Design a protein around this ligand. Sequence first.
Ligand SMILES: Cc1nc(N)c2ncn([C@@H]3O[C@H](COP(=O)(O)OP(=O)(O)OP(=O)(O)O)[C@@H](O)[C@@H]3F)c2n1
Ligand SMILES: Cc1nc(N)c2ncn([C@@H]3O[C@H](COP(=O)(O)OP(=O)(O)OP(=O)(O)O)[C@@H](O)[C@@H]3F)c2n1
Ligand SMILES: Cc1nc(N)c2ncn([C@@H]3O[C@H](COP(=O)(O)OP(=O)(O)OP(=O)(O)O)[C@@H](O)[C@@H]3F)c2n1
Ligand SMILES: Cc1nc(N)c2ncn([C@@H]3O[C@H](COP(=O)(O)OP(=O)(O)OP(=O)(O)O)[C@@H](O)[C@@H]3F)c2n1
Ligand code: NA
Ligand code: NA
Ligand code: NA
Ligand code: NA
Ligand code: NA
Ligand code: NA
Ligand code: NA
Ligand code: NA
Ligand code: NA
Ligand code: NA
Ligand code: NA
Lengths: 481, 481, 466, 481
Amino acid sequence: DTMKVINDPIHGHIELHPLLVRIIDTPQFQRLRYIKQLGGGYYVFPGASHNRFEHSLGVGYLAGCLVHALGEKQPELQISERDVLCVQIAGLCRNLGHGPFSHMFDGRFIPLARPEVKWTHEQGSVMMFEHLINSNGIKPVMEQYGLIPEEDICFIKEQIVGPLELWPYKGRPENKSFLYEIVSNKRNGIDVDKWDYFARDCHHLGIQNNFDYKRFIKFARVCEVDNELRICARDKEVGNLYDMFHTRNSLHRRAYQHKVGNIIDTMITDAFLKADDYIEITGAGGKKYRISTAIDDMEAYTKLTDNIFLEILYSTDPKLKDAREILKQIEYRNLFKYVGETQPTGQIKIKREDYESLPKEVASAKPKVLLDVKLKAEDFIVDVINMDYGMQEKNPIDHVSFYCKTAPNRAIRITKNQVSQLLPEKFAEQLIRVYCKKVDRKSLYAARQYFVQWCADRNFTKPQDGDVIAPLITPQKKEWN
Amino acid sequence: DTMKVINDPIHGHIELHPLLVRIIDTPQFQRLRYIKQLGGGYYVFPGASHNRFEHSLGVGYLAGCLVHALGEKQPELQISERDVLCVQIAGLCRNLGHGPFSHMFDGRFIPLARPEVKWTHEQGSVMMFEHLINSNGIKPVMEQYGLIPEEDICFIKEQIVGPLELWPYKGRPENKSFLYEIVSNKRNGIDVDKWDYFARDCHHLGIQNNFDYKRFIKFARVCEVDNELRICARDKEVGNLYDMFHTRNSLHRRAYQHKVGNIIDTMITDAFLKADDYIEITGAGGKKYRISTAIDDMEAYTKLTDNIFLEILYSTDPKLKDAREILKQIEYRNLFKYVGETQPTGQIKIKREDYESLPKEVASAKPKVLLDVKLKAEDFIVDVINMDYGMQEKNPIDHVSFYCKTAPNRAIRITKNQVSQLLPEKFAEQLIRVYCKKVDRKSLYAARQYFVQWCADRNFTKPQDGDVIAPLITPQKKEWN
Amino acid sequence: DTMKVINDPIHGHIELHPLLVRIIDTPQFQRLRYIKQLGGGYYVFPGASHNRFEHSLGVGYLAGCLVHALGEKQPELQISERDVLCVQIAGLCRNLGHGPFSHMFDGRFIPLARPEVKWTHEQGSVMMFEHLINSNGIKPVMEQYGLIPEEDICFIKEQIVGPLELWPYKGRPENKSFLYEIVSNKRNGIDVDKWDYFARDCHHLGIQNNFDYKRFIKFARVCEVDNELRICARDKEVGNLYDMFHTRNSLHRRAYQHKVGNIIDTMITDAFLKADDYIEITGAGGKKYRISTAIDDMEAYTKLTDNIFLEILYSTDPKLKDAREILKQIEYRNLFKYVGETQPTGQIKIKREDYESLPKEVASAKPKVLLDVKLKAEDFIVDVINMDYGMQEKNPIDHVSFYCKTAPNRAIRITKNQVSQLLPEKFAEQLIRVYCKKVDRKSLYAARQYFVQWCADRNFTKPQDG
Amino acid sequence: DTMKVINDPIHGHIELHPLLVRIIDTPQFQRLRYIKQLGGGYYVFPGASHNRFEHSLGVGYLAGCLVHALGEKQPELQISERDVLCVQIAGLCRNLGHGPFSHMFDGRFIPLARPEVKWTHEQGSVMMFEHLINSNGIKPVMEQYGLIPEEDICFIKEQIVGPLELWPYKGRPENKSFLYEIVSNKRNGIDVDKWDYFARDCHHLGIQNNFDYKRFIKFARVCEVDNELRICARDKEVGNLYDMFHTRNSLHRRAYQHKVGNIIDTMITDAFLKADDYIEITGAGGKKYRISTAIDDMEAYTKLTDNIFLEILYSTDPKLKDAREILKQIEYRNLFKYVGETQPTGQIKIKREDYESLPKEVASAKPKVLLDVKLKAEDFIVDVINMDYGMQEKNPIDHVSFYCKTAPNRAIRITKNQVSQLLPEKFAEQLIRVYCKKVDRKSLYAARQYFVQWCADRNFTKPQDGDVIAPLITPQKKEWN
Ligand SMILES: Cc1nc(N)c2ncn([C@@H]3O[C@H](COP(=O)(O)OP(=O)(O)OP(=O)(O)O)[C@@H](O)[C@@H]3F)c2n1
Ligand SMILES: Cc1nc(N)c2ncn([C@@H]3O[C@H](COP(=O)(O)OP(=O)(O)OP(=O)(O)O)[C@@H](O)[C@@H]3F)c2n1
Ligand SMILES: Cc1nc(N)c2ncn([C@@H]3O[C@H](COP(=O)(O)OP(=O)(O)OP(=O)(O)O)[C@@H](O)[C@@H]3F)c2n1
Ligand SMILES: Cc1nc(N)c2ncn([C@@H]3O[C@H](COP(=O)(O)OP(=O)(O)OP(=O)(O)O)[C@@H](O)[C@@H]3F)c2n1
Ligand code: NA
Ligand code: NA
Ligand code: NA
Ligand code: NA
Ligand code: NA
Ligand code: NA
Ligand code: NA
Ligand code: NA
Ligand code: NA
Ligand code: NA
Ligand code: NA
């Protein structure tokens, strides 16, 4: 058990402490080799073959970089080797809870399969970390390297999911508050997890990363702000932070919310739903779970990866025929067809509980156009996407503190108007995409007229292509011209 | 004279037609090897050693890529080899008019040295091109390769500077209107010149380029818009175009308007002004010109490059002592000191004719603080920066036309609200930076009080570090807290 | 059916003709999404998650770039749109025959599972291409776009596997000879397939690519050489070609033959062998095949991918326990243990047909040392690695033709001595690595003594680390 | 001062200690902004605009990286902050002695202008460092930061040039021997200076770097070898070190010895020689120096940069006409024409004293061919290039020591045959290029016949194009087949 050096295409030669190596070399961690970072995105961007495993190594790496840099510049913070290891472990382990095709699983499949349960990848990561520790005898190894497992396990979990229940954390005291801002920053979202995915996703997607995390690290300091020690940025770096969030939004627009990538995730989800009654996953004590219930038993969940897609695709069981056929149609590129995109106007914000009513609404629209085919609710898919700066309607830069060159330990606030008038006025929006499951030319024509009529009825924005797809519907709305 | 291959670190292996090689291998073109692309920026970003020469090769290259792509996808446009060569030549030659330290010359020095003249690098490029053609016997070579010099020289100049002044161009007819949108796009600023400098400046600065010009080319088409053939983008590329302009603005913020780079350009300009009566540049017929009059004689201007800085720095003439001393202080990094930055609020805009009144205004401010030193007008520099999307207050994307996949010959418009609510609400602003020529601690303290008081008096934005630099001044303004 | 644009991180925005899209959007092609390019290498280089699919797109792309460039510079070659499409198709389809974990399958598993059969990924690619065409109704689509399936299918297969057996090809005549040097260059190995994998593997591994393929394309021309039209390089580029091969050898040394990646491929192969009676793959007419017999039915082979590893790993059947346990030990990083390395001396080379006798040989060695444990044949792995410039002992640059700037239609040869005295004197060598499946300290000690004795018996080089 | 951050395109965000900033901000250091790293190479590779300044920053950076890494892993070496600063200063300052166009100056111009003197850039760097320190009051600043100038200046100079006259060094004792292997490694050439130029030259040239220096650092240790502490590599790195030298040789072949770049350096050298009697450079006490004598006065040398090229090019003095005309012909790309390349056969180098006899020999060749025009010795340029692995005929890897991970304190040797049979058999060779100053087609034809005949007469290798350029001459030589 000495340190290992690993060559990563993003970060280069990265050192892994032997405790980290012990954690990595387990079935619970290695599982992440079989879960694509971007899920259905690979079916649009063929470079995006990268998995959650290598992203996890990068996050643990960068978590160590930031905590080491803070400690080197400010010995007065009393950051210990124990603290550094705990932060690196949380960075390494904060992706353990992801399921097949990453956000497809927690974002689309579980909400539909198990609408009563409240599952997040964060909670999954806590449960899987616990399973990893207990199944692999990691506690005596933590101890060997100076950790105190009771307190430090708690600290690691809290970094992943937040307070496990006035300073709300139990794993560390307030004087180490800043340590909770490294791995998953619940105050403003500025964390090393974003820095790794920006660089790594860009490298694989073939889109170029404009955020410089190493610069950020160089300019980062810990300061007291309203009685608490926070990571603060240099004042003049504020434009770079606005640009960090702009980068995140552009990656979502270009890649993660690609309209075809989304429909592929939707089809895969549909296949998994049709397969869920028939695939069995053996868990603890030989008990049997489903795709949708493996989340209840970490032994079963350990065996739940992107393999499920191929188990379905390669199946011969007649009960899996309908699931298998959806996947086959993905392979033939016989996809549900994209009809268009619109946005709500104003403060209007469509809620998750209304999502199911939307396809009916589209099908109930009455376009004043000559139509052969008539479409029903079940022929439409309506995908609602929330785009924001990570704090719903809030500006995350209002939740950052800065320091000046003349007083580096003295935290200040910077308002948006002190920065630029070219910045966003709003920090959250919704995109609404409509697709049609009938793919012939007459059905697509019809779907376009229902869609643009529905936009007009709901006072949503004019589709970008609306004059071309629905020339007889767009003139009715004077707000559109 | 066959086709020559050149290896460029941005574009790779580029082919140059023999006519282009003939144009490049002249003193008028080769001059651009001695003019830094980013001028004083090298003194802040040590990677930014690149010159106007290699940028020009890249612009010529990309101009050819775009015109070739358009011709290949749309044979009906009747783009000829002659058209391709003329576009490549304009792309190659549109930087011929730059002077020492590029934007320092036309942006700072000429306005101060020759306030009566209206000089632009574009006009310079036309004059230098004409000089290059006539001095090197290029016309019979244009002819050899199928160009018609009268029409084609006119066409090339018009691409560079616009109409030489109802269709206002003489070099080509309206059926080739789109050709004028390649090299210098006066309609919306989307041109190949930006594409080269984004990539090349980023390469040298150590900042990563987020705009994909090759994608843009792939999706570009020519469509009829209001009776004219224009280059149009695919509808779904609109976000990428908003991002192109965001990229340009971020490069200005991080690099081109760096507060120290600007003060260095200011000092160099001051040295050139103090040198201008004494440096001689020999032009046509042995006539002598000054730095400020070389623009009147292309033979003298051919010899006016960044060398002027070293001629001053290395001089022994006592008449050049004052100019030389400024440059010496740059080498010792004894720079004028940055006092702070502010912005006017709203649509309020300081104009070029007011620039000279500003240091007097700062010096006339009456901070209610005990001050040891008192400062005069001549102790202050006030640098006003216009940041915009290239069309003053206008949104350039309102001046782009798009096409849809279902009707690729049908041009449409797309409004900002049809795209995203996270986009800029304004497309222009001004930054005001103040510096002090006296660099001792008491003078800098005093300068900061005058500055912040002036900001408060004029209702400009609170300096980002205002509470730290001027804690007794910031409390007066309740909007600042 | 218009052109599609696809964004690749290596090549950028690549255009795909609609016929190519039709070929790509099949189960036979899409399968390649589930086969890692570098197999076991991912378990050493965590960036090496890339699959054969994206590599195939890149090869099709570069095949089109080269044939287009040649056509543009030399209209006299009469390269047609039909020729361009056929070259792009061969480039796209020359990886169809790869099996689970790529070289693990054809290099390690099939030789052990089916020692009587003579399988290559090239032959596999031809069989899978034919399966793809016939199962998906591609022929009437080729016709719609002006291809002639009889001649063109033949031409595509020949680009992949060589003559299907005087000009030995049937798909094109000798006046289009040069077209056969693009996708898989059997004359000297300079082909677009290498160019894509250098760039793509380097991108994923985190090692930087030395070779400039775009330069090569720019300087490539077709010239008559001994009555045949061949792709020739500019004379001045000869150093760059020696460097192309050096690049290939460095990628093998650093990555593809990494000693840990190799032992992982060896363990996976061992798990597949132990699983082979129990994993079932359904083929044509509902017939069932094994991992080792899926190659006998393309419908079954279509469903044979890296998934097999997870099917084994996630299995609960006691019949699969031994296979499953090997894969489990990979996850715990409990690997078969490296014992040592040696080389034959001179041009001496151990041949593929002797590979299976080698572990028995090591186990039969009689070291004159005090040895506690005794080991059997099945406890040893002996991995023979051929490092060469792609033509066994030959210098591939002796099989390249060049042209000079003063006579661009005149092909010449360039010898090694005309280039540099710093070049390799030899173009092939063999490395022999030995590992032990018993990993305790006494067994490893013993394995080392048998190994060094075997080296002495065979007159191999003295192992390092005495 | 505090710590300054500089953004470098190769290394990213680099920290400079304030003592380093004081050294950099001097006329003697800033001078390196005006000296191209690759000289005439820019006239072939337009990306190669980079100067000695930014390379020096990178070398100082990497010198600090390596010495820091060694100290962190091996506290027993007693590397002090003082040692780290001294190593960084030597790294920073080891390019101070370069002259106009870098290797053109010490490699071509000084040998011809001052054949009696033995000038090297290393000696120049020592003299310039001394001048920098004394002219800028650096000693009291060294002292402020804990350095001891007497010992430490000596140490810095010794790192640059080697022993200034049994352990031969005075700046540090034998127990810090390894510190002399960082900046300029005279034992085997493995130093940080190569690592910076590999990366930086590749970035600018547009050729990709295949050497990973960060990996090397990770695997580097100090071990005792034959009673001395040396930097040693892990055993596994041996292949990578052979490849590092292969990389260096390939960069020389592709770029630094480009046949056209070399002829351009030759023409510039010729221009400088013709200018040398007439250009004046003012040195200490107003004394005047020439281009060839500025090396004798550091105050004059401080003002001797690439500017000399433009001073000549822009001159009007009739005495400079002949120099100026050569430079003008470079601008028109009227270059001496490349005739061909050959190599000597067998073992003994052609020596420098025979170089002058070579053009005569070529002109005296008697090709048995009909030739109308006849050429003289002075129409030929013969450029002899020594290509090697940095230790003449020796294999530098025979001078590296390695360690195995289970015995990291035991240094061993690894022989070529223990690595691969595919490695070079020889480590040094000569390339001979011939050019003709007469550029018409009949003269070039003739030059080619003389050249190939001369190759045959001297038993040199067959030119690659020999059968095409000289079809009547190549049949005579049975060794050519
Ligand atoms: C850039 C580069 N170049 C190499 N020559 C090279 N050799 C191995 N790697 C990569 O380094 C990482 C460490 O592999 P490495 O081979 O250095 O270490 P090992 O653990 O196999 O050997 P040992 O030190 O235990 O004896 C791995 O991600 C990958 F192999 C390399 N990466
Ligand atoms: C990446 C790379 N690799 C090379 N081996 C290499 N050799 C030359 N270059 C670069 O190519 C460009 C063309 O140089 P090249 O040497 O091909 O042109 P030349 O004019 O010297 O030869 P010729 O055709 O007239 O006989 C130039 O920018 C630079 F030399 C290279 N770039
Ligand atoms: C660098 C870059 N930037 C983007 N904004 C961007 N958007 C899509 N891509 C990528 O281009 C490729 C084409 O995607 P694209 O979105 O252009 O094609 P589509 O088939 O969805 O649209 P349509 O023309 O059929 O309406 C794909 O590999 C990936 F989606 C992008 N790549
Ligand atoms: C990648 C990147 N992004 C930036 N936003 C950015 N701003 C400055 N730089 C670059 O960092 C380096 C340091 O610039 P910086 O502006 O941090 O230093 P300063 O000396 O002007 O500020 P202060 O600390 O004295 O107030 C320099 O090489 C260049 F300006 C940037 N580089
Ligand atoms: Na920052
Ligand atoms: Na910014
Ligand atoms: Na224009
Ligand atoms: Na100059
Ligand atoms: Na056939
Ligand atoms: Na072939
Ligand atoms: Na079948
Ligand atoms: Na699977
Ligand atoms: Na290259
Ligand atoms: Na190394
Ligand atoms: Na190597």
